[PDB]
Amino acid sequence: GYCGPCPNNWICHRNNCYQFFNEEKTWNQSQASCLSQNSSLLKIYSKEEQDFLKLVKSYHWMGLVQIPANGSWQWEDGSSLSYNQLTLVEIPKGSCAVYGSSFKAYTEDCANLNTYICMKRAV
Amino acid sequence: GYCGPCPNNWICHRNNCYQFFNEEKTWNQSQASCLSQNSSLLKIYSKEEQDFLKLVKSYHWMGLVQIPANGSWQWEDGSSLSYNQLTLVEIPKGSCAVYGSSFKAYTEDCANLNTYICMKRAV
């Protein structure tokens, strides 16, 4: 069958759309860049349905952030981080997270410059 | 727009279809597995149009083999390996090649067991 719809030249899988950007930006600028293209930073909503992402090397900003008050990690769509989605390595002080392959994420200072991955959840 | 057509749950990009198999097989068994699903082992026909593949980690069988006589490397579709497609590291004796990320390939004994990537070139 066909996969989509998706922005031109984006990778499509189960109707989810992904694109990898190597221009480095802060977490906020990365999220903004994704939003300007009608998407959001990468969200791992299901390891089973996003299996190939385990093969993505290096580190990239994803849509996982820390809440100021309670300090609870949640995705940009407001949903909360679940145990079965990925293994988050909480390294001191950082309030944003980079995806680091193998369904593992690492906390970092949001002002750090990183490449990033945008995703459009299917409808 | 839409991307495809592609086998169910395969990754689609510019209408090319890809799937990553972690069950390890010899080069021949890997090619056969791809063929049985109407595809062929991964071919890098254009670094520009297959850019995201630079991010694929580990090593996987691809459709690049050595010809018995002249010993010229060519893809499975008969086309010849071009300089601008990838950097092939010819390590002694092997007649098959594994893709090793960053558009680099490494020669290996075809009987080695490796994970593999299948691809359906667009039409």
DSSP chain A: --B---STT-EEETTEEEEEEEEEE-HHHHHHHHHTTT-EE---S-TTTTGGGGGB-S-EEEEEEE-TTT--EEETTSPBP-TTT-EEE--TT--EEEE-STTEEEEE-TTS-EEEEEEE---
A-B contacts (CB, under 8 Å): 62
Asked if A23 reaches chain B (Cβ–Cβ under 8 Å), the answer is: no
Secondary structure of chain B as H, E, C letters: CCECCCCCCCEEECCEEEEEEEEEECHHHHHHHHHCCCCEECCCCCCCCCHHHHHECCCEEEEEEECCCCCCEEECCCCECCCCCCEEECCCCCCEEEECCCCEEEEECCCCCEEEEEEECCC
Q: Do B55 and A57 touch (CB under 8 A)?
A: yes
Question: Looking at CA atoms only, how far is residue A102 from chain B in angstroms?
Answer: 10
| Cβ atoms within 10 Å of B116's Cβ, excluding its own | 28
To 5 degrees, how large is the angle CA B71–CA B77–CA B83?
60
Asked if A5 reaches chain B (Cβ–Cβ under 8 Å), the answer is: yes
φ/ψ (deg, to 5) at A39: -145, -175
φ/ψ (deg, to 5) at B2: -100, 155
> Can you tell me the distance from the alpha carbon of A72 to that of B91, in angstroms, rounded to the nearest whole number?
50
Q: Which domains does chain A have, with CATH numbers?
A: 1-123 (3.10.100.10)
Contacts of B57 in chain A (CB under 8 A): 55-57, 101
> Can you tell me the distance from the alpha carbon of B33 to that of A23, in angstroms, rounded to the nearest whole number?
37
Q: What is the largest CA-CA distance in chain A?
A: 45
Tokens, residue B101: 């990320």
Whether a cis peptide bond, with omega within 30° of 0, leads into A92 is no
Chain A's closest residue to B101, CA to CA, is A57
Residues A48, B34, B26, B92, CA torsion sign:
negative
Place of tokens 């080695």: B112
Method by which the model was determined: X-ray
Contacts of B10 in chain A (CB under 8 A): 13
Place of tokens 């950007």: A21
Question: Looking at CA atoms only, how far is residue B86 from chain A in angstroms?
Answer: 18
